[PDB]
Amino acid sequence: IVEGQDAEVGLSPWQVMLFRKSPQELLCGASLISDRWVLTAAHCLLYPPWDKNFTVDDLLVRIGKHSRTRYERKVEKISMLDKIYIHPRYNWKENLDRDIALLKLKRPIELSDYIHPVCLPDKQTAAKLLHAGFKGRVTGWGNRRETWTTSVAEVQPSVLQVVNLPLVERPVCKASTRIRITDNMFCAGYKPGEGKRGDACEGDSGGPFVMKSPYNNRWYQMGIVSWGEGCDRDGKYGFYTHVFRLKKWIQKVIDRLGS
C-alpha cells in the first residue's frame, strides 16, 4: 500500500495472507468469507508468463496476523488448503479478465476477535454503494514504494497498512490505460491534483477492497486487488476484480460443485 497508514489491531479481521512454503515468502493478500473458504486473485496461483502454477502443496494461509513476519502465537492461525478453484474463463494472456479464485481450507477455522468473515454483496448493496466518488478501503502488507529503494527509505511495511480510495467513473478508467478493460473490473484512486494519494502495490494482490454499509453497518467485499500501471502514479488508477459481477460462479462452486 502506498501513502497508507498503520492499521489498528483487528481492523480487517477477514484479512488472510498467502505465504509461499519455500522460499518462505509473502505472496498475496486474500480474504476470509466463511469459516472454510478464502477469496484471492487467480493470478496469485496461476500465471503462466512467470511459470507460476501453484498447487495445494505449494503454500499455506496465515490468518489473524498484523505483523508482517513474526509468528504471533496468541492470535495467528496457520492453515493448509484442500482444493483450489480458479475461474474457467480467467484471462491472464490479455487483461487478467475474471481474475478470481476460491481456496478451501483443509479444516474449518475457529473464529475470534481477530478472525471474522466479510460479507459478499447483494443486488441491493452492490447497486446503492457502487457509485463513483464513494470511498472503499484496501489493506495489505505489500510494498510502500514502487521504486525498490536504493536511496530514500524502506519499502516493506512492519504491520498491516490501510488506505481509503474513491471509486472512479468507468470512462476515466478506460481513458487512463491503454489496456482493454472489462465489466469484470473497476478502478479507484484519486485524480491528479485532488489533494490525496494512495494505491495498492506489489504484494497486495488478492487483498480485499471493502465498503461499510450505512444500512446495516456490515462490511461488504466489493473488489479484489488485481493489477495496475506502477503504484501511486499520476493519471493512473488501480484495477480491482468486480466481485458482484462474479458472485454466481462463487455460488456455483460453493453450493453445488464444491461441498
Binding site: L27, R73, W148, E202, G203, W227, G228, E229
Partner: protein, 103 residues
C-alpha cells in the same frame, strides 16, 4: 512511453535483475528494462541479496518444555516451536504424536 509494459499484476515473485537489484516480480523488472535499462535482464530468482532474518519464533521464548513430535520426525520443545517451524524451518509441519519422536 504510455506505460503499456508497466501494467503489472500486483503480486510478489521477486527476481534478481542484472540491474544489481531485487525486482518485486518479473513484470516490474521488464517495465524498468524499458523505462530505463534496455539491456536489463533477469539473472536469478529470489532477492539479489538475502533478506535480513529476524527472530520469527521469538514469541516462543521462555515457553515450558513439553516436547512434541512432528510429521518431519523432529522433536520440538513445545507446540509454539512446532507451529513456528511450519512457516519457517519446516513448512507445513504438523503434530504427529506427543512427547519425543520415539525413533
Amino acid at each position: 512511453e504510455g506505460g503499456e509494459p508497466c501494467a503489472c499484476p500486483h503480486a510478489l515473485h521477486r527476481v534478481c535483475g542484472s540491474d544489481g537489484e531485487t525486482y518485486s516480480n518479473p513484470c516490474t523488472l521488464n517495465c524498468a528494462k524499458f523505462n530505463g535499462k534496455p539491456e536489463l535482464v533477469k539473472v536469478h530468482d529470489g532477492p539479489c541479496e538475502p533478506d535480513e532474518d529476524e527472530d520469527v519464533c521469538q514469541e516462543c521464548d521462555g515457553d515450558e518444555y513439553k516436547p512434541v513430535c512432528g510429521s518431519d520426525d523432529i522433536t520440538y520443545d513445545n507446540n509454539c516451536r512446532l507451529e513456528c517451524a511450519s512457516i519457517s524451518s519446516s513448512p507445513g509441519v504438523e503434530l504427529k504424536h506427543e512427547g519425543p519422536c520415539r525413533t
